[PDB]
Backbone:
């Protein structure tokens, strides 16, 4: 979902969460950057038997100290 | 309609884009604020739309109000 | 009211703000304290207490007692 | 079989590969595709095809499709 800020992208988020119920979950930035095969990573644990995960608020990647996303 | 004064500066309107030299931008921002302490945030701001349109010419699509408002 | 008498002693009344040259305070504190020994401590105090009047001039918001009291 | 005319074009059968210098690509195609910033993705490969011949001479393994076939 690409666009400028304050374009109502969260409106669809809040509509879909209410429409779906418990099957929708918001997940932070751990899964696309941080390693999940090493250490305790409940992020992959809670997604079991879920129908929708969301990920947002991704910051700048060119900033100093920002970890580049491993594919 | 604000062509006249810009045409007095020798600039040429290409693709309805006002040619703002990068050096002039640095000069006008440094006239008001320090540039050494404001380098990181400024470069982060400009990296989003920075591109090499020419080998040595870089025009910015932002027009300062002080350059178009008569004193 | 007593700023004018201090004004002739190297102080400029800019926006009712006392302007203190750096070297005046450097010499006054180095007349007794070896600045080499506590250079880091003085530097830490400075950047914790530095105030930017403008891009170039730096001033301290204090008036020495001997500056106003006659010897 | 095209070595009859490519010999006059500067093709040299070294390491069983005949290609073009890297310098001519910047003026023709890479004018809008800068290699100083966004070219790194290919540079990692390019460095694996360069040879210890000259520091100021670049030898890139790329042949234009239209350079041989008449449009």
Residues:
């Amino acid at each position: 979902f690409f666009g400028e800020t304050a374009t109502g992208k969260s409106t669809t988020k809040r509509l879909l969460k209410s429409a779906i119920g418990d099957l929708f979950v918001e997940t932070g930035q751990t899964i696309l950057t941080d390693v999940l095969d090493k250490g305790p990573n409940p992020f992959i644990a809670n997604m079991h038997l879920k129908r929708s995960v969301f990920c947002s608020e991704l910051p700048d990647f060119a900033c100093s100290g920002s970890k580049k996303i491993r594919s | 309609p604000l062509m006249t004064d810009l045409s007095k500066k020798g600039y040429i309107l290409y693709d309805n884009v006002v040619t703002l030299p990068l050096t002039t931008f640095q000069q006008k921002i440094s006239k008001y604020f320090n540039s050494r302490l404001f380098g990181h945030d400024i470069e982060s701001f400009i990296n989003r739309h920075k591109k090499f349109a020419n080998v040595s010419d870089e025009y910015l699509q932002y027009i300062f109000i002080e350059d178009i408002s008569s004193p």
